[PDB]
PDB file of all heavy atoms in Angstrom:
ATOM      1  N   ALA A   1      -9.515  15.469  92.268  1.00  0.00           N
ATOM      2  CA  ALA A   1      -8.232  15.845  91.681  1.00  0.00           C
ATOM      3  C   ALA A   1      -7.140  15.232  92.555  1.00  0.00           C
ATOM      4  O   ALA A   1      -5.966  15.162  92.190  1.00  0.00           O
ATOM      5  CB  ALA A   1      -8.094  17.355  91.656  1.00  0.00           C
ATOM      6  N   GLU A   2      -7.571  14.772  93.718  1.00  0.00           N
ATOM      7  CA  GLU A   2      -6.701  14.171  94.700  1.00  0.00           C
ATOM      8  C   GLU A   2      -6.054  12.895  94.160  1.00  0.00           C
ATOM      9  O   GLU A   2      -4.913  12.575  94.498  1.00  0.00           O
ATOM     10  CB  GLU A   2      -7.534  13.904  95.957  1.00  0.00           C
ATOM     11  CG  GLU A   2      -6.769  13.814  97.252  1.00  0.00           C
ATOM     12  CD  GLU A   2      -5.715  14.877  97.392  1.00  0.00           C
ATOM     13  OE1 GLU A   2      -4.615  14.692  96.825  1.00  0.00           O
ATOM     14  OE2 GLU A   2      -5.985  15.894  98.062  1.00  0.00           O
ATOM     15  N   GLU A   3      -6.765  12.170  93.304  1.00  0.00           N
ATOM     16  CA  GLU A   3      -6.208  10.937  92.749  1.00  0.00           C
ATOM     17  C   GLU A   3      -5.501  11.093  91.399  1.00  0.00           C
ATOM     18  O   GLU A   3      -5.260  10.109  90.708  1.00  0.00           O
ATOM     19  CB  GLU A   3      -7.298   9.850  92.666  1.00  0.00           C
ATOM     20  CG  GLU A   3      -8.643  10.303  92.112  1.00  0.00           C
ATOM     21  CD  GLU A   3      -9.750   9.270  92.335  1.00  0.00           C
ATOM     22  OE1 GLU A   3      -9.615   8.128  91.840  1.00  0.00           O
ATOM     23  OE2 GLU A   3     -10.752   9.606  93.011  1.00  0.00           O
ATOM     24  N   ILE A   4      -5.158  12.325  91.036  1.00  0.00           N
ATOM     25  CA  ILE A   4      -4.470  12.599  89.774  1.00  0.00           C
ATOM     26  C   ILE A   4      -2.961  12.653  90.007  1.00  0.00           C
ATOM     27  O   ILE A   4      -2.482  13.435  90.833  1.00  0.00           O
ATOM     28  CB  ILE A   4      -4.920  13.961  89.147  1.00  0.00           C
ATOM     29  CG1 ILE A   4      -6.392  13.891  88.733  1.00  0.00           C
ATOM     30  CG2 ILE A   4      -4.037  14.303  87.938  1.00  0.00           C
ATOM     31  CD1 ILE A   4      -6.949  15.198  88.165  1.00  0.00           C
ATOM     32  N   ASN A   5      -2.214  11.829  89.277  1.00  0.00           N
ATOM     33  CA  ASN A   5      -0.761  11.791  89.415  1.00  0.00           C
ATOM     34  C   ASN A   5      -0.072  11.830  88.074  1.00  0.00           C
ATOM     35  O   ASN A   5       1.148  11.732  87.991  1.00  0.00           O
ATOM     36  CB  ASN A   5      -0.317  10.529  90.145  1.00  0.00           C
ATOM     37  CG  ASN A   5      -0.767  10.507  91.578  1.00  0.00           C
ATOM     38  OD1 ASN A   5      -1.922  10.189  91.880  1.00  0.00           O
ATOM     39  ND2 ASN A   5       0.139  10.862  92.483  1.00  0.00           N
ATOM     40  N   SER A   6      -0.857  11.958  87.019  1.00  0.00           N
ATOM     41  CA  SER A   6      -0.294  12.012  85.687  1.00  0.00           C
ATOM     42  C   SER A   6      -0.703  13.321  85.039  1.00  0.00           C
ATOM     43  O   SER A   6      -1.713  13.912  85.408  1.00  0.00           O
ATOM     44  CB  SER A   6      -0.782  10.826  84.858  1.00  0.00           C
ATOM     45  OG  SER A   6      -2.197  10.787  84.796  1.00  0.00           O
ATOM     46  N   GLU A   7       0.100  13.770  84.082  1.00  0.00           N
ATOM     47  CA  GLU A   7      -0.147  15.010  83.361  1.00  0.00           C
ATOM     48  C   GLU A   7      -1.594  15.152  82.919  1.00  0.00           C
ATOM     49  O   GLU A   7      -2.201  14.217  82.426  1.00  0.00           O
ATOM     50  CB  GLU A   7       0.786  15.108  82.148  1.00  0.00           C
ATOM     51  CG  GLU A   7       1.119  13.791  81.482  1.00  0.00           C
ATOM     52  CD  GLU A   7       2.347  13.134  82.073  1.00  0.00           C
ATOM     53  OE1 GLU A   7       2.817  13.601  83.128  1.00  0.00           O
ATOM     54  OE2 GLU A   7       2.847  12.154  81.486  1.00  0.00           O
ATOM     55  N   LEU A   8      -2.135  16.341  83.116  1.00  0.00           N
ATOM     56  CA  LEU A   8      -3.506  16.635  82.752  1.00  0.00           C
ATOM     57  C   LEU A   8      -3.533  16.925  81.259  1.00  0.00           C
ATOM     58  O   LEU A   8      -2.714  17.688  80.754  1.00  0.00           O
ATOM     59  CB  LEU A   8      -3.984  17.859  83.555  1.00  0.00           C
ATOM     60  CG  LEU A   8      -5.465  18.195  83.774  1.00  0.00           C
ATOM     61  CD1 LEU A   8      -6.016  18.983  82.613  1.00  0.00           C
ATOM     62  CD2 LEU A   8      -6.244  16.894  83.996  1.00  0.00           C
ATOM     63  N   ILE A   9      -4.455  16.299  80.542  1.00  0.00           N
ATOM     64  CA  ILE A   9      -4.563  16.551  79.115  1.00  0.00           C
ATOM     65  C   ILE A   9      -5.840  17.306  78.755  1.00  0.00           C
ATOM     66  O   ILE A   9      -6.946  16.838  78.998  1.00  0.00           O
ATOM     67  CB  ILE A   9      -4.466  15.241  78.319  1.00  0.00           C
ATOM     68  CG1 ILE A   9      -2.997  14.809  78.283  1.00  0.00           C
ATOM     69  CG2 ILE A   9      -4.999  15.431  76.901  1.00  0.00           C
ATOM     70  CD1 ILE A   9      -2.679  13.743  77.279  1.00  0.00           C
ATOM     71  N   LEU A  10      -5.669  18.492  78.185  1.00  0.00           N
ATOM     72  CA  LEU A  10      -6.791  19.334  77.792  1.00  0.00           C
ATOM     73  C   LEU A  10      -6.941  19.365  76.287  1.00  0.00           C
ATOM     74  O   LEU A  10      -5.958  19.378  75.558  1.00  0.00           O
ATOM     75  CB  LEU A  10      -6.588  20.771  78.283  1.00  0.00           C
ATOM     76  CG  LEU A  10      -6.629  21.093  79.782  1.00  0.00           C
ATOM     77  CD1 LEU A  10      -6.353  22.591  79.973  1.00  0.00           C
ATOM     78  CD2 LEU A  10      -7.996  20.702  80.377  1.00  0.00           C
ATOM     79  N   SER A  11      -8.185  19.388  75.827  1.00  0.00           N
ATOM     80  CA  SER A  11      -8.470  19.453  74.405  1.00  0.00           C
ATOM     81  C   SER A  11      -8.398  20.922  74.012  1.00  0.00           C
ATOM     82  O   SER A  11      -8.489  21.800  74.878  1.00  0.00           O
ATOM     83  CB  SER A  11      -9.868  18.916  74.127  1.00  0.00           C
ATOM     84  OG  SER A  11     -10.861  19.694  74.771  1.00  0.00           O
ATOM     85  N   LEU A  12      -8.223  21.200  72.721  1.00  0.00           N
ATOM     86  CA  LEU A  12      -8.160  22.586  72.280  1.00  0.00           C
ATOM     87  C   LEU A  12      -9.391  23.369  72.726  1.00  0.00           C
ATOM     88  O   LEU A  12      -9.278  24.524  73.139  1.00  0.00           O
ATOM     89  CB  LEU A  12      -8.007  22.663  70.763  1.00  0.00           C
ATOM     90  CG  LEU A  12      -6.551  22.556  70.309  1.00  0.00           C
ATOM     91  CD1 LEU A  12      -6.469  22.390  68.798  1.00  0.00           C
ATOM     92  CD2 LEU A  12      -5.804  23.802  70.773  1.00  0.00           C
ATOM     93  N   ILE A  13     -10.563  22.741  72.660  1.00  0.00           N
ATOM     94  CA  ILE A  13     -11.792  23.407  73.077  1.00  0.00           C
ATOM     95  C   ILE A  13     -11.684  23.863  74.536  1.00  0.00           C
ATOM     96  O   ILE A  13     -12.036  24.993  74.861  1.00  0.00           O
ATOM     97  CB  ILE A  13     -13.010  22.482  72.886  1.00  0.00           C
ATOM     98  CG1 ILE A  13     -13.302  22.334  71.396  1.00  0.00           C
ATOM     99  CG2 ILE A  13     -14.232  23.053  73.562  1.00  0.00           C
ATOM    100  CD1 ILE A  13     -14.469  21.428  71.100  1.00  0.00           C
ATOM    101  N   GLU A  14     -11.193  22.988  75.406  1.00  0.00           N
ATOM    102  CA  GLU A  14     -11.025  23.330  76.812  1.00  0.00           C
ATOM    103  C   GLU A  14      -9.923  24.384  76.995  1.00  0.00           C
ATOM    104  O   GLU A  14     -10.096  25.377  77.712  1.00  0.00           O
ATOM    105  CB  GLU A  14     -10.652  22.089  77.619  1.00  0.00           C
ATOM    106  CG  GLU A  14     -11.731  21.051  77.682  1.00  0.00           C
ATOM    107  CD  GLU A  14     -11.378  19.925  78.618  1.00  0.00           C
ATOM    108  OE1 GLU A  14     -10.386  19.219  78.349  1.00  0.00           O
ATOM    109  OE2 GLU A  14     -12.090  19.748  79.627  1.00  0.00           O
ATOM    110  N   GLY A  15      -8.782  24.152  76.351  1.00  0.00           N
ATOM    111  CA  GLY A  15      -7.677  25.084  76.461  1.00  0.00           C
ATOM    112  C   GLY A  15      -8.016  26.493  76.001  1.00  0.00           C
ATOM    113  O   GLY A  15      -7.672  27.475  76.664  1.00  0.00           O
ATOM    114  N   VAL A  16      -8.684  26.594  74.857  1.00  0.00           N
ATOM    115  CA  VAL A  16      -9.060  27.887  74.317  1.00  0.00           C
ATOM    116  C   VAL A  16     -10.003  28.580  75.300  1.00  0.00           C
ATOM    117  O   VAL A  16      -9.911  29.791  75.510  1.00  0.00           O
ATOM    118  CB  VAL A  16      -9.730  27.735  72.908  1.00  0.00           C
ATOM    119  CG1 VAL A  16     -10.266  29.080  72.416  1.00  0.00           C
ATOM    120  CG2 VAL A  16      -8.709  27.205  71.907  1.00  0.00           C
ATOM    121  N   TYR A  17     -10.901  27.814  75.917  1.00  0.00           N
ATOM    122  CA  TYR A  17     -11.833  28.388  76.883  1.00  0.00           C
ATOM    123  C   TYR A  17     -11.072  28.950  78.082  1.00  0.00           C
ATOM    124  O   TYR A  17     -11.234  30.127  78.432  1.00  0.00           O
ATOM    125  CB  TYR A  17     -12.834  27.339  77.376  1.00  0.00           C
ATOM    126  CG  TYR A  17     -13.849  27.907  78.346  1.00  0.00           C
ATOM    127  CD1 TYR A  17     -14.695  28.946  77.961  1.00  0.00           C
ATOM    128  CD2 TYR A  17     -13.935  27.442  79.659  1.00  0.00           C
ATOM    129  CE1 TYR A  17     -15.597  29.513  78.854  1.00  0.00           C
ATOM    130  CE2 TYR A  17     -14.836  28.006  80.565  1.00  0.00           C
ATOM    131  CZ  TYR A  17     -15.662  29.044  80.148  1.00  0.00           C
ATOM    132  OH  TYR A  17     -16.548  29.624  81.016  1.00  0.00           O
ATOM    133  N   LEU A  18     -10.245  28.104  78.703  1.00  0.00           N
ATOM    134  CA  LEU A  18      -9.459  28.507  79.864  1.00  0.00           C
ATOM    135  C   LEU A  18      -8.566  29.716  79.587  1.00  0.00           C
ATOM    136  O   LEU A  18      -8.412  30.598  80.442  1.00  0.00           O
ATOM    137  CB  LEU A  18      -8.612  27.336  80.358  1.00  0.00           C
ATOM    138  CG  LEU A  18      -9.432  26.177  80.933  1.00  0.00           C
ATOM    139  CD1 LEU A  18      -8.495  25.066  81.399  1.00  0.00           C
ATOM    140  CD2 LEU A  18     -10.299  26.677  82.088  1.00  0.00           C
ATOM    141  N   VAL A  19      -7.970  29.759  78.403  1.00  0.00           N
ATOM    142  CA  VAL A  19      -7.132  30.892  78.053  1.00  0.00           C
ATOM    143  C   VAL A  19      -8.001  32.148  78.075  1.00  0.00           C
ATOM    144  O   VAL A  19      -7.663  33.141  78.718  1.00  0.00           O
ATOM    145  CB  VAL A  19      -6.524  30.731  76.652  1.00  0.00           C
ATOM    146  CG1 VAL A  19      -6.050  32.082  76.140  1.00  0.00           C
ATOM    147  CG2 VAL A  19      -5.369  29.730  76.697  1.00  0.00           C
ATOM    148  N   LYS A  20      -9.127  32.091  77.371  1.00  0.00           N
ATOM    149  CA  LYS A  20     -10.049  33.213  77.306  1.00  0.00           C
ATOM    150  C   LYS A  20     -10.504  33.615  78.705  1.00  0.00           C
ATOM    151  O   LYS A  20     -10.798  34.782  78.956  1.00  0.00           O
ATOM    152  CB  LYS A  20     -11.264  32.839  76.458  1.00  0.00           C
ATOM    153  CG  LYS A  20     -12.312  33.927  76.318  1.00  0.00           C
ATOM    154  CD  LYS A  20     -13.637  33.311  75.889  1.00  0.00           C
ATOM    155  CE  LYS A  20     -14.753  34.342  75.791  1.00  0.00           C
ATOM    156  NZ  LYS A  20     -14.616  35.217  74.596  1.00  0.00           N
ATOM    157  N   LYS A  21     -10.557  32.652  79.616  1.00  0.00           N
ATOM    158  CA  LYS A  21     -10.993  32.925  80.984  1.00  0.00           C
ATOM    159  C   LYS A  21      -9.851  33.458  81.834  1.00  0.00           C
ATOM    160  O   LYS A  21     -10.032  33.740  83.028  1.00  0.00           O
ATOM    161  CB  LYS A  21     -11.551  31.655  81.644  1.00  0.00           C
ATOM    162  CG  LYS A  21     -12.781  31.063  80.974  1.00  0.00           C
ATOM    163  CD  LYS A  21     -13.896  32.091  80.766  1.00  0.00           C
ATOM    164  CE  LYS A  21     -14.332  32.719  82.064  1.00  0.00           C
ATOM    165  NZ  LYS A  21     -15.528  33.586  81.848  1.00  0.00           N
ATOM    166  N   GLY A  22      -8.675  33.576  81.219  1.00  0.00           N
ATOM    167  CA  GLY A  22      -7.503  34.080  81.912  1.00  0.00           C
ATOM    168  C   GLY A  22      -6.972  33.126  82.961  1.00  0.00           C
ATOM    169  O   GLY A  22      -6.070  33.469  83.725  1.00  0.00           O
ATOM    170  N   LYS A  23      -7.534  31.925  83.007  1.00  0.00           N
ATOM    171  CA  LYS A  23      -7.098  30.931  83.970  1.00  0.00           C
ATOM    172  C   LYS A  23      -5.963  30.055  83.442  1.00  0.00           C
ATOM    173  O   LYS A  23      -5.516  29.136  84.122  1.00  0.00           O
ATOM    174  CB  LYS A  23      -8.276  30.040  84.371  1.00  0.00           C
ATOM    175  CG  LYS A  23      -9.165  30.612  85.468  1.00  0.00           C
ATOM    176  CD  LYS A  23     -10.103  31.681  84.961  1.00  0.00           C
ATOM    177  CE  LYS A  23     -11.116  32.064  86.039  1.00  0.00           C
ATOM    178  NZ  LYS A  23     -12.184  32.976  85.529  1.00  0.00           N
ATOM    179  N   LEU A  24      -5.476  30.351  82.242  1.00  0.00           N
ATOM    180  CA  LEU A  24      -4.429  29.529  81.645  1.00  0.00           C
ATOM    181  C   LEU A  24      -3.645  30.183  80.519  1.00  0.00           C
ATOM    182  O   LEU A  24      -4.205  30.882  79.670  1.00  0.00           O
ATOM    183  CB  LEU A  24      -5.055  28.245  81.115  1.00  0.00           C
ATOM    184  CG  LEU A  24      -4.207  27.297  80.277  1.00  0.00           C
ATOM    185  CD1 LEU A  24      -3.101  26.710  81.119  1.00  0.00           C
ATOM    186  CD2 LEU A  24      -5.092  26.193  79.744  1.00  0.00           C
ATOM    187  N   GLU A  25      -2.341  29.935  80.519  1.00  0.00           N
ATOM    188  CA  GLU A  25      -1.444  30.456  79.494  1.00  0.00           C
ATOM    189  C   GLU A  25      -0.990  29.262  78.677  1.00  0.00           C
ATOM    190  O   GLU A  25      -0.783  28.180  79.219  1.00  0.00           O
ATOM    191  CB  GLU A  25      -0.232  31.127  80.137  1.00  0.00           C
ATOM    192  CG  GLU A  25      -0.441  32.587  80.461  1.00  0.00           C
ATOM    193  CD  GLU A  25      -0.326  33.468  79.232  1.00  0.00           C
ATOM    194  OE1 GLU A  25      -0.961  33.153  78.207  1.00  0.00           O
ATOM    195  OE2 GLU A  25       0.400  34.479  79.294  1.00  0.00           O
ATOM    196  N   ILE A  26      -0.843  29.444  77.374  1.00  0.00           N
ATOM    197  CA  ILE A  26      -0.418  28.337  76.539  1.00  0.00           C
ATOM    198  C   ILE A  26       0.807  28.651  75.704  1.00  0.00           C
ATOM    199  O   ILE A  26       0.967  29.760  75.194  1.00  0.00           O
ATOM    200  CB  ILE A  26      -1.584  27.853  75.661  1.00  0.00           C
ATOM    201  CG1 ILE A  26      -2.519  26.997  76.527  1.00  0.00           C
ATOM    202  CG2 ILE A  26      -1.071  27.053  74.472  1.00  0.00           C
ATOM    203  CD1 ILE A  26      -3.912  26.893  75.995  1.00  0.00           C
ATOM    204  N   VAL A  27       1.680  27.657  75.587  1.00  0.00           N
ATOM    205  CA  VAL A  27       2.922  27.798  74.846  1.00  0.00           C
ATOM    206  C   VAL A  27       3.131  26.650  73.888  1.00  0.00           C
ATOM    207  O   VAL A  27       2.758  25.513  74.179  1.00  0.00           O
ATOM    208  CB  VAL A  27       4.125  27.846  75.809  1.00  0.00           C
ATOM    209  CG1 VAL A  27       5.426  27.729  75.037  1.00  0.00           C
ATOM    210  CG2 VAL A  27       4.094  29.137  76.594  1.00  0.00           C
ATOM    211  N   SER A  28       3.727  26.957  72.741  1.00  0.00           N
ATOM    212  CA  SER A  28       4.023  25.948  71.733  1.00  0.00           C
ATOM    213  C   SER A  28       5.494  26.071  71.382  1.00  0.00           C
ATOM    214  O   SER A  28       5.860  26.821  70.475  1.00  0.00           O
ATOM    215  CB  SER A  28       3.181  26.164  70.479  1.00  0.00           C
ATOM    216  OG  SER A  28       3.388  25.109  69.558  1.00  0.00           O
ATOM    217  N   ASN A  29       6.330  25.336  72.112  1.00  0.00           N
ATOM    218  CA  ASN A  29       7.772  25.367  71.901  1.00  0.00           C
ATOM    219  C   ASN A  29       8.264  26.803  71.791  1.00  0.00           C
ATOM    220  O   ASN A  29       8.608  27.275  70.709  1.00  0.00           O
ATOM    221  CB  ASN A  29       8.155  24.582  70.641  1.00  0.00           C
ATOM    222  CG  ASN A  29       8.413  23.111  70.923  1.00  0.00           C
ATOM    223  OD1 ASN A  29       8.639  22.322  70.001  1.00  0.00           O
ATOM    224  ND2 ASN A  29       8.389  22.735  72.199  1.00  0.00           N
ATOM    225  N   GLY A  30       8.282  27.496  72.922  1.00  0.00           N
ATOM    226  CA  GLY A  30       8.744  28.868  72.930  1.00  0.00           C
ATOM    227  C   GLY A  30       7.666  29.882  72.618  1.00  0.00           C
ATOM    228  O   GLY A  30       7.471  30.830  73.378  1.00  0.00           O
ATOM    229  N   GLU A  31       6.959  29.697  71.506  1.00  0.00           N
ATOM    230  CA  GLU A  31       5.915  30.642  71.130  1.00  0.00           C
ATOM    231  C   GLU A  31       4.763  30.669  72.131  1.00  0.00           C
ATOM    232  O   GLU A  31       4.300  29.632  72.611  1.00  0.00           O
ATOM    233  CB  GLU A  31       5.384  30.330  69.725  1.00  0.00           C
ATOM    234  CG  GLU A  31       4.289  31.288  69.262  1.00  0.00           C
ATOM    235  CD  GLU A  31       3.949  31.140  67.789  1.00  0.00           C
ATOM    236  OE1 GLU A  31       3.709  29.999  67.334  1.00  0.00           O
ATOM    237  OE2 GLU A  31       3.915  32.174  67.090  1.00  0.00           O
ATOM    238  N   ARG A  32       4.316  31.878  72.442  1.00  0.00           N
ATOM    239  CA  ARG A  32       3.225  32.101  73.376  1.00  0.00           C
ATOM    240  C   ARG A  32       1.975  32.321  72.528  1.00  0.00           C
ATOM    241  O   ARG A  32       1.839  33.351  71.867  1.00  0.00           O
ATOM    242  CB  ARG A  32       3.532  33.342  74.212  1.00  0.00           C
ATOM    243  CG  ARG A  32       2.708  33.530  75.466  1.00  0.00           C
ATOM    244  CD  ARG A  32       3.158  34.823  76.141  1.00  0.00           C
ATOM    245  NE  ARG A  32       2.538  35.068  77.440  1.00  0.00           N
ATOM    246  CZ  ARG A  32       2.765  36.155  78.176  1.00  0.00           C
ATOM    247  NH1 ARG A  32       3.594  37.096  77.736  1.00  0.00           N
ATOM    248  NH2 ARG A  32       2.166  36.303  79.352  1.00  0.00           N
ATOM    249  N   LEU A  33       1.075  31.341  72.531  1.00  0.00           N
ATOM    250  CA  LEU A  33      -0.155  31.423  71.751  1.00  0.00           C
ATOM    251  C   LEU A  33      -1.292  32.034  72.546  1.00  0.00           C
ATOM    252  O   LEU A  33      -1.655  31.523  73.603  1.00  0.00           O
ATOM    253  CB  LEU A  33      -0.578  30.032  71.279  1.00  0.00           C
ATOM    254  CG  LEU A  33       0.270  29.331  70.216  1.00  0.00           C
ATOM    255  CD1 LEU A  33       0.380  30.228  68.995  1.00  0.00           C
ATOM    256  CD2 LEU A  33       1.639  29.013  70.763  1.00  0.00           C
ATOM    257  N   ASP A  34      -1.852  33.131  72.047  1.00  0.00           N
ATOM    258  CA  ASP A  34      -2.967  33.771  72.739  1.00  0.00           C
ATOM    259  C   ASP A  34      -4.274  33.220  72.197  1.00  0.00           C
ATOM    260  O   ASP A  34      -4.271  32.318  71.358  1.00  0.00           O
ATOM    261  CB  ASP A  34      -2.927  35.294  72.567  1.00  0.00           C
ATOM    262  CG  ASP A  34      -2.995  35.727  71.121  1.00  0.00           C
ATOM    263  OD1 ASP A  34      -2.881  34.867  70.217  1.00  0.00           O
ATOM    264  OD2 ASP A  34      -3.158  36.941  70.888  1.00  0.00           O
ATOM    265  N   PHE A  35      -5.388  33.763  72.676  1.00  0.00           N
ATOM    266  CA  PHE A  35      -6.714  33.313  72.248  1.00  0.00           C
ATOM    267  C   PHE A  35      -6.942  33.305  70.731  1.00  0.00           C
ATOM    268  O   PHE A  35      -7.399  32.310  70.179  1.00  0.00           O
ATOM    269  CB  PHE A  35      -7.791  34.172  72.905  1.00  0.00           C
ATOM    270  CG  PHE A  35      -9.188  33.722  72.605  1.00  0.00           C
ATOM    271  CD1 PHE A  35      -9.755  32.671  73.306  1.00  0.00           C
ATOM    272  CD2 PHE A  35      -9.936  34.346  71.611  1.00  0.00           C
ATOM    273  CE1 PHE A  35     -11.048  32.246  73.022  1.00  0.00           C
ATOM    274  CE2 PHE A  35     -11.226  33.931  71.318  1.00  0.00           C
ATOM    275  CZ  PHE A  35     -11.786  32.880  72.023  1.00  0.00           C
ATOM    276  N   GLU A  36      -6.637  34.418  70.067  1.00  0.00           N
ATOM    277  CA  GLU A  36      -6.822  34.535  68.625  1.00  0.00           C
ATOM    278  C   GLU A  36      -6.082  33.430  67.887  1.00  0.00           C
ATOM    279  O   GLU A  36      -6.626  32.812  66.976  1.00  0.00           O
ATOM    280  CB  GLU A  36      -6.323  35.896  68.126  1.00  0.00           C
ATOM    281  CG  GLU A  36      -7.102  37.111  68.635  1.00  0.00           C
ATOM    282  CD  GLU A  36      -6.989  37.318  70.140  1.00  0.00           C
ATOM    283  OE1 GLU A  36      -7.593  36.537  70.900  1.00  0.00           O
ATOM    284  OE2 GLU A  36      -6.293  38.262  70.567  1.00  0.00           O
TER     285      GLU A  36
END
């Protein structure tokens, strides 16, 4: 991760997982999207 200098891009599959794991919060232009 030491050589990462650009925005990290996560797929919905990864994002949904991380959210469910409580390791990540997601937002869509103001709206706070939860797991469901």
Side-chain angles (χ1 to χ4, degrees):
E2 204 43 278
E3 45 192 300
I4 294 177
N5 293 80
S6 57
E7 34 270 11
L8 200 275
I9 284 194
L10 292 178
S11 62
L12 275 170
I13 288 179
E14 294 187 297
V16 174
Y17 182 60
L18 293 180
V19 162
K20 180 199 177 74
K21 298 308 302 187
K23 277 77 171 188
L24 172 66
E25 272 282 49
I26 282 158
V27 169
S28 185
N29 271 175
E31 180 169 50
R32 195 181 186 182
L33 290 304
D34 60 350
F35 184 81
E36 295 65 287

